Design a protein around this ligand. Structure first.
Ligand SMILES: Nc1ncnc2c1ncn2[C@@H]1O[C@H](CSCC[C@H](N)C(=O)O)[C@@H](O)[C@H]1O
Length: 431
């Protein structure tokens, strides 16, 4: 049982236990800062911290929040929580299972969790997510962070508090399973309106990339938004979907493992000629083929620059996280976003800038408005290289809209190089 697994740490109510890591003091302040800085401004918010343990995130929320409900099902973690946070007067405490937490409906601006769904069975996962829908105001936020595929301490097990003599009951699910669950969930309120989670992004916690070489500490930020259309509303269908999504992912690995991108020869060649201080932005949606993508690890090895790469298909995003763990190149990080605009939205809010773009199907896959918005996250006169499928140069040139703030300086037939159909290398620059 998960309660007895955690209750046995009752006398170790400390940071090591919260991260199940004997070296947590090398990680905790950086992990906390990574998570906090990706959250919305929670000044004046009603926050709910579920599975809070001793309350390390509650300590930070209390500085600015209107109110924090801080909850956990281990009584002595809440006792240490109250002791550590005794100076604050804006925190109420509940010893409760996440599922039995009492929160008023439409009362909460942020439901915050960090390592929780991995301690719930599939049925409990779904029921809990539906509880957060009920607690959240419209436009409210849900934060989820989970250990995907393997424990946070990774294969080395260095510093892990998991006993080698006892089984570990934790569920280490695929990041693509949680992502689809959040994407497809639907909930109907007491007045008959249906809602969904707008999943703003999926990201790896950088502290664990940098210090643990673990890209599979994945977290998500979601907004509760109206949804007349549906994904899956039935709880039992949602439960079954989680198993189907795992199977589909296993077949994606079987298909993709060890296959190099058909675009790799062209990209290596031109990028070997170009000089791009800033990270590079990589975008790979894989619209026409699962085998046409940007090899970010080759970009980083050749340019020496850090790379932020976006995959918009949850299955391919998860596969590239696998590749990151295998390559162990800290310069490369992957993210998931619904589309280009979602990525621009996030990075623009951070006022981040990228030194150039290397993409496949950037024009094939994206609206005119989003391509026009891309300048918001790019350095001045940044250059964009994208491999585009087309019927012909004339087909492409007709009915492609060049954003007013850039110009295409080359549309080169590279069809003979993108092979196991017409492929164009489009070279553009910001004006
Ligand atoms: N079903 C459940 N309901 C409430 N708390 C739970 C729970 N399952 C696990 N927990 C608690 O969730 C915590 C996971 S360890 C993570 C603690 C905290 N979120 C942090 O990041 O620092 C533990 O404190 C454990 O006791």
């Amino acid at each position: 049982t998960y309660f007895s697994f955690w209750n046995k740490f009752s006398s170790n109510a400390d940071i090591n236990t919260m991260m199940l890591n004997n070296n947590a003091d090398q990680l905790e302040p950086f992990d906390r800062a990574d998570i906090i800085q990706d959250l919305p401004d929670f000044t004046g918010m009603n926050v709910v911290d579920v599975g809070a343990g001793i309350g390390r995130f509650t300590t930070t929320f209390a500085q600015r929040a209107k109110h924090v409900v801080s909850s956990d099902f281990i009584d002595s973690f809440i006792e240490k929580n109250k002791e550590r946070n005794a100076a604050f007067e804006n925190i109420t405490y509940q010893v409760s299972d996440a599922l039995g937490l009492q929160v008023d409906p439409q009362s909460t601006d942020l439901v915050f969790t960090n390592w929780l769904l991995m301690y719930l069975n599939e049925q409990e996962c779904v029921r809990f997510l539906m509880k957060t829908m009920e607690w959240l105001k419209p436009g409210g936020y849900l934060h989820v962070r989970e250990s995907c595929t393997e424990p946070s301490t990774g294969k080395s097990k260095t510093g892990s508090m998991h006993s080698d003599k006892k089984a570990n009951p934790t569920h280490y699910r695929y990041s693509s399973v949680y992502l689809q669950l959040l994407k497809e969930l639907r909930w109907t309120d007491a007045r008959g309106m249906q809602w969904r989670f707008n999943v703003l992004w999926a990201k790896s916690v950088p502290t664990y990339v940098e210090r643990v070489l673990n890209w599979r500490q994945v977290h998500w930020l979601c907004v509760k938004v109206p949804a007349q259309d549906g994904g899956i509303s039935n709880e039992k269908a949602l439960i079954s979907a989680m198993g189907r999504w795992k199977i589909i992912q296993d077949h994606t690995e079987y298909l993709l493992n060890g296959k190099t991108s058909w675009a790799t020869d062209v990209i290596n060649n031109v990028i070997s000629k170009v000089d791009f201080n800033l990270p590079l932005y990589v975008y790979s949606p894989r619209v026409v083929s699962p085998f046409v993508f940007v090899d970010s690890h080759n970009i980083a090895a050749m340019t020496g620059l850090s790379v932020w790469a976006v995959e918009t298909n949850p299955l391919f995003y998860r596969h590239m996280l696998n590749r990151c763990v295998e390559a162990k190149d800290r310069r490369v990080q992957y993210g998931w976003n619904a589309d280009l605009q979602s990525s621009i939205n996030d990075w623009g809010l951070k006022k981040a800038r990228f030194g150039g773009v290397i993409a496949t199907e950037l024009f094939m896959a994206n609206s005119d408005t989003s391509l026009m918005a891309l300048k918001e996250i790019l350095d001045d006169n940044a250059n964009i290289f994208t491999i585009e499928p087309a019927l012909s140069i004339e087909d492409f040139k007709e009915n492609v809209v060049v954003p007013e703030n850039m110009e295409m300086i080359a549309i080169t037939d590279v069809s003979a190089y993108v092979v196991c159909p017409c492929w164009l290398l489009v070279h553009a620059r910001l004006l």
